[PDB]
Motif scaffolding. Structure first.
Motif, PDB file in Angstrom:
ATOM      1  N   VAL A   1       0.812  -1.210   0.000  1.00 30.80           N
ATOM      2  CA  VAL A   1       0.000   0.000   0.000  1.00 30.80           C
ATOM      3  C   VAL A   1       0.850   1.267   0.000  1.00 30.80           C
ATOM      4  O   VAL A   1       0.353   2.334  -0.379  1.00 30.80           O
ATOM      5  N   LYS A   2       2.122   1.188   0.401  1.00 27.13           N
ATOM      6  CA  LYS A   2       2.980   2.362   0.360  1.00 27.13           C
ATOM      7  C   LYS A   2       3.673   2.543  -0.983  1.00 27.13           C
ATOM      8  O   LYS A   2       4.153   3.646  -1.266  1.00 27.13           O
ATOM      9  N   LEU A   3       3.753   1.491  -1.803  1.00 30.24           N
ATOM     10  CA  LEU A   3       4.214   1.678  -3.177  1.00 30.24           C
ATOM     11  C   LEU A   3       3.240   2.539  -3.969  1.00 30.24           C
ATOM     12  O   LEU A   3       3.655   3.402  -4.752  1.00 30.24           O
ATOM     13  N   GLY A   4       1.943   2.315  -3.782  1.00 35.35           N
ATOM     14  CA  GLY A   4       0.928   3.030  -4.528  1.00 35.35           C
ATOM     15  C   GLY A   4      -0.111   2.094  -5.104  1.00 35.35           C
ATOM     16  O   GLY A   4      -1.089   2.535  -5.714  1.00 35.35           O
ATOM     17  N   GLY A   5       0.091   0.790  -4.909  1.00 34.70           N
ATOM     18  CA  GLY A   5      -0.844  -0.211  -5.365  1.00 34.70           C
ATOM     19  C   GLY A   5      -1.967  -0.437  -4.364  1.00 34.70           C
ATOM     20  O   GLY A   5      -2.076   0.224  -3.337  1.00 34.70           O
ATOM     21  N   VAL A   6      -2.815  -1.406  -4.693  1.00 32.32           N
ATOM     22  CA  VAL A   6      -3.965  -1.766  -3.873  1.00 32.32           C
ATOM     23  C   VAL A   6      -3.709  -3.138  -3.270  1.00 32.32           C
ATOM     24  O   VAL A   6      -3.406  -4.094  -3.995  1.00 32.32           O
ATOM     25  N   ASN A   7      -3.809  -3.228  -1.941  1.00 32.75           N
ATOM     26  CA  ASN A   7      -3.632  -4.510  -1.267  1.00 32.75           C
ATOM     27  C   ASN A   7      -4.757  -5.470  -1.620  1.00 32.75           C
ATOM     28  O   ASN A   7      -4.514  -6.550  -2.171  1.00 32.75           O
TER      29      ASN A   7
END
Ligand SMILES: [Mg+2]
Length: 421
Positions: free
Chosen positions: A160-166
Motif C-alpha cells: 500500500v505504500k508503493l501506490g498499489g492496492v492490497n
RNA sequence: UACAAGAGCCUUUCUGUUG
RNA sequence: CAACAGAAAGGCUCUUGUU
C-alpha cells in the motif's frame, strides 16, 4: 449486539481467491494481491545496531518477505539495490536524498529501527514533507524472528505504500454508496503537551481518491496552541477535492467526514465551524457545487479466551443519554485482557446514510485497514487521520501558523502517495 | 516503530459533589 | 484554596502470537 458479517476481501492475482475473516483476522497464505504492483527498485536500510540485527538476519528477512510476497502476488524482483548502515537523525538526510536521486521511479524506502527514537521522526518528516516518497519502518525485534503474520502485515504495508492496492472488498457486497464516486475524509487534532504554551496544535485531514477505498491522500496544517477546531479546513479539503477530481475523473456525490481527537464536551464547537469550512471548500471551487456532507465522530474510547466483546456489537442503552442521537457503536473485538475498542457517534449527517449501511461501511473500512490482516478499532480514514496527525508531531521536531505551517506541508507527489499506510 | 488492544506511573486540561 | 472523582492529551515500561 449484532455481529456484522465481515465482507469478502478480494485478493487478486492468478487465483483471485477470497480471504474471509474469521474471528476478526484472516490468513494471507495462498492469497495474492489485487493490484500488487511490480517492484522494480526498492531500498532497505539498517538504522538498528549491527550487534543486535546482523546482515545475515536482514538477508533472511528480505528473502522470506520476498517469498511471502510471491505468494501474495507481489513480485519483488532481485536483491535490493541499497543496503547500508547509518545511525542518528542527522544521517537521515544524505542517505534519503541519495535514495531519491539514484533510483528513478523508486516508490518506497524501508528502514529498520531499534525502538523509540527521534530517527523515526526524522525519516517520517523527510519522507512526507521534505523529499517526497513513502517511508516504511519496522522494529528491530520483529526482523530477527519473523512470524508469517509479521511478514504478511509488513508486506501489506509495503504494497500500500508503493501506490498499489492490497485488496479491494466485495463489490456485490459493498454498500451502494460505491455506486457513485464518493470520498471519505478523516480529521484529527493532536494537542501540544501540557505545560508548554508555545507549541502549535495539529490539524490533519485525509481523503480518498479511488472507487475502492484503498488509496487515500492527506495533508496537515498547524494552528493555535491546543486549538480544538480545524483552522483552515477549506484550503486542504479543496486540495483533496481537486486531487480526487484529478484521480477518479469525477466529482464526488457523497462525502463522509470522520472526526478524531476531540473531547465529548465540545463536539458542536468543532461542528459549526468545520462543516461550514467544508462548504467554504465546496462553494469556492465550482459554481452550484453542493454535495452532501456527513459529520460522524470517532474516539478509541464471548470471543476467545479473554471473553472480549465481538466486533460490530450494537447497543443503544445504559451507557449514554436517552435523548440526543448518541448512536453508540463499536466495530472491533479485543484479543487479551479488557475490550475498550472505539466509539463512533453520528451527529445528524446529510447523505441519508442509514445505520446498517454506515455500520457496513465502517466495518469495511476497518477491514480496509492496510497495515494488518485484522479488523481494527477505528476505521481506516480515522486511523489515517490519527497517524497523519502523529506524523505532524514528527514534523515539528526542533523547528499559530507560520514556519510551522510550512514544515508540515505535504510534498507534491506525496499526497498521491500513501505515506501513512 | 508489522498490526492489535491491555496493564503500571507522571502531568496538565475539561465537566460533577463538596469547598 | 484544598479534598472524592470521571474523561481527554503526551512521555515512559511489560506481556501476548495473532500463520
Ligand atoms: Mg491523538
Amino acid at each position: 449486539g449484532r455481529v456484522l458479517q465481515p465482507p469478502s476481501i478480494l485478493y487478486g492475482g492468478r487465483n483471485k481467491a477470497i480471504a474471509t475473516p474469521v474471528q476478526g483476522v484472516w490468513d494471507m497464505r495462498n492469497k495474492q494481491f489485487h493490484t500488487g504492483i511490480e517492484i522494480k527498485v526498492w531500498a532497505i536500510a539498517c538504522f538498528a545496531p549491527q550487534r543486535q540485527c546482523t546482515e545475515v538476519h536482514l538477508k533472511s528477512f528480505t528473502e522470506q518477505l520476498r517469498k511471502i510476497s510471491r505468494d501474495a502476488g507481489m513480485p519483488i524482483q532481485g536483491q535490493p539495490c541499497f543496503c547500508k548502515y547509518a545511525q542518528g537523525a542527522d544521517s537521515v538526510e544524505p542517505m534519503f536524498r541519495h535514495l531519491k536521486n539514484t533510483y528513478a521511479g523508486l516508490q518506497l524506502v524501508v528502514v529498520i529501527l531499534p525502538g523509540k527514537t527521534p530517527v523515526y521522526a526524522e525519516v517520517k518528516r523527510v519522507g512526507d514533507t521534505v523529499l517526497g516518497m513513502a517511508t516504511q519502518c519496522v522494529q528491530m525485534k520483529n526482523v530477527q524472528r519473523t512470524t508469517p503474520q509479521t511478514l504478511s502485515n509488513l508486506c501489506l504495508k509495503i504494497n500500500v505504500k508503493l501506490g498499489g492496492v492490497n485488496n479491494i472488498l466485495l463489490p456485490q457486497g459493498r454498500p451502494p454508496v460505491f455506486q457513485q464516486p464518493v470520498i471519505f475524509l478523516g480529521a484529527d487534532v493532536t494537542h501540544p503537551p501540557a505545560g508548554d504554551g508555545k507549541k502549535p496544535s495539529i490539524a490533519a485531514v485525509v481523503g480518498s481518491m479511488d472507487a475502492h477505498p484503498n488509496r487515500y491522500c492527506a495533508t496537515v496544517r498547524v494552528q493555535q496552541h491546543r486549538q480544538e477546531i480545524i483552522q483552515d479546513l477549506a484550503a486542504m479539503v479543496r486540495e483533496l477535492l481537486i486531487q480526487f477530481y484529478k484521480s477518479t475523473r469525477f466529482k464526488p456525490t457523497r462525502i463522509i467526514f470522520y472526526r478524531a481527537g476531540v473531547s465529548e464536551g465540545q463536539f458542536q464547537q468543532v461542528l459549526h465551524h468545520e462543516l461550514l469550512a467544508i462548504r467554504e471548500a465546496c462553494i469556492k471551487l465550482e459554481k452550484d457545487y453542493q454535495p452532501g456532507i456527513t459529520f460522524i465522530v470517532v474516539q478509541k474510547r464471548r470471543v476467545g479466551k479473554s471473553g472480549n466483546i465481538p466486533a460490530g456489537t450494537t447497543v443503544d442503552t445504559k451507557i449514554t443519554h436517552p435523548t440526543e442521537f448518541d448512536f453508540y457503536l463499536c466495530s472491533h473485538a479485543g484479543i487479551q485482557g479488557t475490550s475498550r475498542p472505539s466509539h463512533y457517534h453520528v451527529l445528524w449527517d446529510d447523505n441519508r446514510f442509514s445505520s446498517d449501511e454506515l455500520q457496513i461501511l465502517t466495518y469495511q473500512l476497518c477491514h480496509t485497514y492496510v497495515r494488518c490482516t485484522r479488523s481494527v478499532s477505528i476505521p481506516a480514514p480515522a486511523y489515517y487521520a490519527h497517524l497523519v496527525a502523529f506524523r505532524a508531531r514528527y514534523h515539528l521536531v526542533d523547528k499559530d501558523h507560520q514556519a510551522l505551517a510550512k514544515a508540515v506541508q505535504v510534498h507534491q507527489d506525496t499526497l498521491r502517495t500513501m505515506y501513512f499506510a
